[PDB]
Each structure stands twice: as structure tokens, then as C-alpha cells.
Amino acid sequence: NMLLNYVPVYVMLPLGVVNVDNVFEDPDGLKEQLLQLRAAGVDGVMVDVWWGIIELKGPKQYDWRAYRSLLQLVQECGLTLQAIMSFHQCGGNVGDIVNIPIPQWVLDIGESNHDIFYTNRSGTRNKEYLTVGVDNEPIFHGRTAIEIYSDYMKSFRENMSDFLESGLIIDIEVGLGPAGELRYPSYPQSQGWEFPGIGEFQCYDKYLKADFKAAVARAGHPEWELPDDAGKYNDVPESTGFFKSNGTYVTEKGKFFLTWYSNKLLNHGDQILDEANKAFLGCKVKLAIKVSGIHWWYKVENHAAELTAGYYNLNDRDGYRPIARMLSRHHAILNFTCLEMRDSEQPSDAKSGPQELVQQVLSGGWREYIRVAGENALPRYDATAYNQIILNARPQGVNNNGPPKLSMFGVTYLRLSDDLLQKSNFNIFKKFVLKMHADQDYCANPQKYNHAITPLKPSAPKIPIEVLLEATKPTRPFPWLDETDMKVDG
Numbered sequence: 001n002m003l004l005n006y007v008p009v010y011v012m013l014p015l016g017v018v019n020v021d022n023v024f025e026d027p028d029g030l031k032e033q034l035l036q037l038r039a040a041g042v043d044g045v046m047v048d049v050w051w052g053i054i055e056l057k058g059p060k061q062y063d064w065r066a067y068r069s070l071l072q073l074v075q076e077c078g079l080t081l082q083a084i085m086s087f088h089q090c091g092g093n094v095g096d097i098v099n100i101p102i103p104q105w106v107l108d109i110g111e112s113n114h115d116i117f118y119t120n121r122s123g124t125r126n127k128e129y130l131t132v133g134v135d136n137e138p139i140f141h142g143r144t145a146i147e148i149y150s151d152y153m154k155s156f157r158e159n160m161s162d163f164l165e166s167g168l169i170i171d172i173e174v175g176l177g178p179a180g181e182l183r184y185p186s187y188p189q190s191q192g193w194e195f196p197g198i199g200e201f202q203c204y205d206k207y208l209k210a211d212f213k214a215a216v217a218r219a220g221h222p223e224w225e226l227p228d229d230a231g232k233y234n235d236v237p238e239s240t241g242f243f244k245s246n247g248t249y250v251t252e253k254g255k256f257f258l259t260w261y262s263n264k265l266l267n268h269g270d271q272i273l274d275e276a277n278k279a280f281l282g283c284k285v286k287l288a289i290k291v292s293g294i295h296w297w298y299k300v301e302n303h304a305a306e307l308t309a310g311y312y313n314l315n316d317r318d319g320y321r322p323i324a325r326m327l328s329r330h331h332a333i334l335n336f337t338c339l340e341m342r343d344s345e346q347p348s349d350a351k352s353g354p355q356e357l358v359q360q361v362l363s364g365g366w367r368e369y370i371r372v373a374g375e376n377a378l379p380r381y382d383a384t385a386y387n388q389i390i391l392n393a394r395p396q397g398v399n400n401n402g403p404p405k406l407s408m409f410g411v412t413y414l415r416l417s418d419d420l421l422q423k424s425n426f427n428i429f430k431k432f433v434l435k436m437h438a439d440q441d442y443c444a445n446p447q448k449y450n451h452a453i454t455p456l457k458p459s460a461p462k463i464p465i466e467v468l469l470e471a472t473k474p475t476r477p478f479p480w481l482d483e484t485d486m487k488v489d490g
Contacts, residue, residue: 006449044080089128133207196350197234262312299351321364340376
């Protein structure tokens with residue numbers, strides 16, 4: 001059945017649908033847009049549930065009223081919802097329309113303790129997220145950063161119990177860093193970074209610094225300090241001592257740091273997902289995390305941009321599969337991006353390989369037997385962009401006798417706007433939805449498109465770090481079609 005080949009499509013809602021003052025501003029306007037998506041056959045929508053909005057009044061003071069109205073509207077429109085536990089800052093750059101900083105009460109704590117933020121070598125503080133360093137430090141009026149995330153998700157599960165029960169919420173994406181992604185804020189625009197800069201390591205806050213010192217000490221190397229030759233945000237790998245050919249990154253010291261640096265993220269995600277599984281135990285939703293798509297420099301041995309972001313990915317070390325294996329014990333989805341990108345669309349000076357990146361990540365996920373979903377990295381309304389997504393949605397195309405050989409769990413389109421609803425753009429979008437649906441009409445029952453909706457089971461047994469890292473063993477990605485068999489056009 002073409003239904004077994006049907007891949008659900010979701011649309012991210014406009015930023016600030018619920019404003020900084022925790023008010024659901026334009027219900028009438030959103031409902032209008034939502035009715036069109038519904039009519040177009042869209043399966044559901046995705047929304048950021050801003051920590052900076054919900055717990056703004058004070059520690060553990062949660063106001064869910066406005067979001068409940070949002071979810072109520074979405075439900076009445078007949079759409080499902082992917083809720084992001086957004087424990088990070090929205091906006092923050094000049095020009096950004098919607099700015100939603102993390103809770104002011106958390107920031108006030110930062111004023112007297114700057115080390116709660118990711119810090120670069122020069123000492124600049126990034127206030128969009130709390131460093132992994134304080135994940136387990138009870139410095140937030142008694143709670144650790146994780147307890148904060150945990151109480152938040154438990155409160156959400158309690159206050160949205162009706163929505164979770166009626167099946168309105170299909171999955172919970174857990175924010176794990178800047179832009180809600182499991183990574184370090186290595187390429188901040190606010191600090192001058194510009195594509196395709198290699199970015200900078202963000203492990204200099206005192207907690208991570210002490211962490212590293214204790215780690216190198218165990219290794220019997222007290223003389224090892226955090227990287228001091230990685231250069232700056234906009235450098236190219238070869239202009240730095242750490243990332244250049246035969247640079248520090250290949251030395252025993254370099255490899256030790258990178259492993260330590262990347263491991264922090266794996267445990268960061270593993271520990272926080274432990275709370276999500278506990279918080280959403282029994283709910284008929286799936287958990288998920290967002291992995292950033294660092295495609296620039298993917299084509300050179302140093303994978304500089306990837307290393308500074310926290311993904312220790314090399315030509316011979318799979319830096320993503322360990323994340324997929326980590327997600328497997330939580331029965332979580334690995335939500336990726338760059339599904340719409342083609343290598344030929346990036347400047348050569350960036351050694352960009354989004355296509356290859358997507359293939360590695362998706363293949364790794366499927367290799368770990370986990371669900372893999374994804375998003376388009378940049379705004380696109382053209383058929384070329386949609387065909388690339390559809391290609392990635394079913395790398396080996398439709399299967400005439402059974403579910404597709406390979407298939408993404410779902411695709412979340414960025415982003416719902418007036419531009420998207422314009423006649424011509426929307427016309428193409430609708431074809432994109434039809435193709436994602438394998439030429440089939442919107443299907444309400446997930447059972448028909450091989451999506452088993454069941455109660456979330458507790459986390460599987462802990463997987464030791466060495467077992468997670470065993471997934472770094474290089475493996476050829478699955479073969480991809482050159483062009484999809486379901487183009488929006490012919």
C-alpha cells in the first residue's frame with residue numbers, strides 16, 4: 001500500500017505564537033492559517049514551549065494557560081502537535097523580531113555567577129542556555145539545571161494531561177542546548193561568527209574547566225590544559241594550530257580533549273532524557289532531541305565546525321551514531337536537519353557536505369534501529385528543495401510491496417508564515433505534502449502508515465560510555481537514490 005510509504009509532515013508554527021508575556025495573541029489569525037494547512041493535508045504542527053515564557057514569574061511558578069489555549073486551538077483544527085521543551089533563548093540577535101530570553105530569575109543568578117553560561121576562550125558569556133557544567137550543580141535556588149528541566153517536563157505532563165490523553169501531542173522534543181539542539185554554542189552570530197567560520201570551543205566556564213582538569217589528572221596528564229590554539233570563530237582550519245594538518249587535534253592530547261568534549265554532550269543528553277522518560281512515562285508520545293546540522297568543513301579531515309560544536313566526527317570516527325545509540329535506550333527520535341540541502345548550493349570555500357552529512361546521520365540512526373525524523377535547515381519554497389526532502393524522506397523511494405526499505409519517521413517543515421500561504425508557494429507546498437504522503441490523501445489513523453502509537457516505556461538499561469563510543473566505528477551509509485521517485489512535479 002502507498003499508505004505504508006506515507007511519511008507524515010509537520011509545520012513549525014510562527015515564532016512567538018504565544019508571546020513573551022505568555023499571551024496567546026492572535027488565535028483568529030493562527031486558526032486561519034491552520035485551517036489551510038489542515039486542508040492541504042498537513043499531519044500536524046511543531047511549537048516551541050519557551051522556558052523563558054512558562055517559568056518567568058519565578059522558580060517553579062508555571063503558567064500554562066496560554067499554551068493550553070494554543071494546544072486547544074490546534075486540536076480543534078484536527079492537527080497533532082510536536083511540543084519542544086525549549087530551555088533556551090529565542091532571538092537575541094539584532095533584527096530578531098521575537099526575543100524570549102531564558103527566565104530572568106535564572107539570569108539574575110548569572111549576574112553573580114557568570115560561569116553558569118557557556119564560555120569561550122576569551123571569556124565571553126553566552127546567555128542562551130546553561131552550560132552542561134551546571135547540569136548537576138544545585139546552584140539555582142537549590143536545584144540543579146537538570147532538576148529544572150525535569151520539574152518543567154513533569155509540570156507540562158501534568159498540565160497537558162488532557163491533550164496528552166486525547167492524542168493531540170505526538171511527541172516531546174527535549175531542548176538540549178542553544179536553539180534547543182544537543183550541541184555547544186560554537187557559532188554565535190552575536191559574537192561575530194559568520195558562515196563558514198570553524199567556530200569556537202565553549203568549554204571554558206569554571207565548572208567544565210574543573211571537570212577537564214580532574215579528567216586529565218586521572219589520565220595522569222596534569223600538564224594538559226583546554227585548547228589554546230584553536231583560533232577564533234571565523235578562522236579556517238588550516239590557519240589554526242589545532243585544526244591544521246597534523247595539528248593538535250590528532251595528538252594524544254587533542255584526541256583526549258575532543259573525546260571529553262563530545263562525551264559531555266552524550267551524557268548531557270542521556271541524563272536529561274532520563275528525566276523525560278520518567279516525566280512522560282506511559283504517555284502515548286515519543287521522545288525526541290534535535291541534532292544540529294554542521295555541514296561546513298564536513299568535506300575536510302578536521303571537520304572543524306563539527307568538533308567545536310561538540311560532534312567528534314571524522315572521516316574515520318562516526319561522531320553521530322553514538323548519539324543515536326544513546327537515544328535508543330530512551331526509545332527517542334533523532335530529529336535532524338538539512339534535508340533540503342544539496343552540496344552544489346554551498347560555496348566551495350566552505351567544504352560543505354550537507355547531503356553526505358544527512359546520509360551518515362540517518363544511516364547511523366537506522367543502524368541503531370531508532371526513528372529518524374528531520375527538518376529543512378533554511379527557508380525554501382521551491383520544488384528543488386522539496387524534492388531533496390522527499391528524497392531524504394525515503395532514500396530508496398517507495399516500495400510497491402510493503403513499507404519503504406528506508407524511511408524517515410517524519411519531516412517537520414520550517415516554517416509557517418504568510419509567504420508559505422501565498423498562492424504559488426502554497427501550491428507547491430501542497431504537492432510536497434502529497435508526495436511525502438506517497439500520493440495518498442491525509443490519513444488520520446497512524447496504524448495505516450506504520451506508526452505504532454503506544455505508551456512510552458521506561459528507559460532501557462544504562463549503556464556504558466565505552467559501549468556508546470563503540471558506535472564510532474566507521475560504516476558506509478546506505479545507498480541513496482540520486483533523484484527521488486516522487487518529485488513534486490513529474
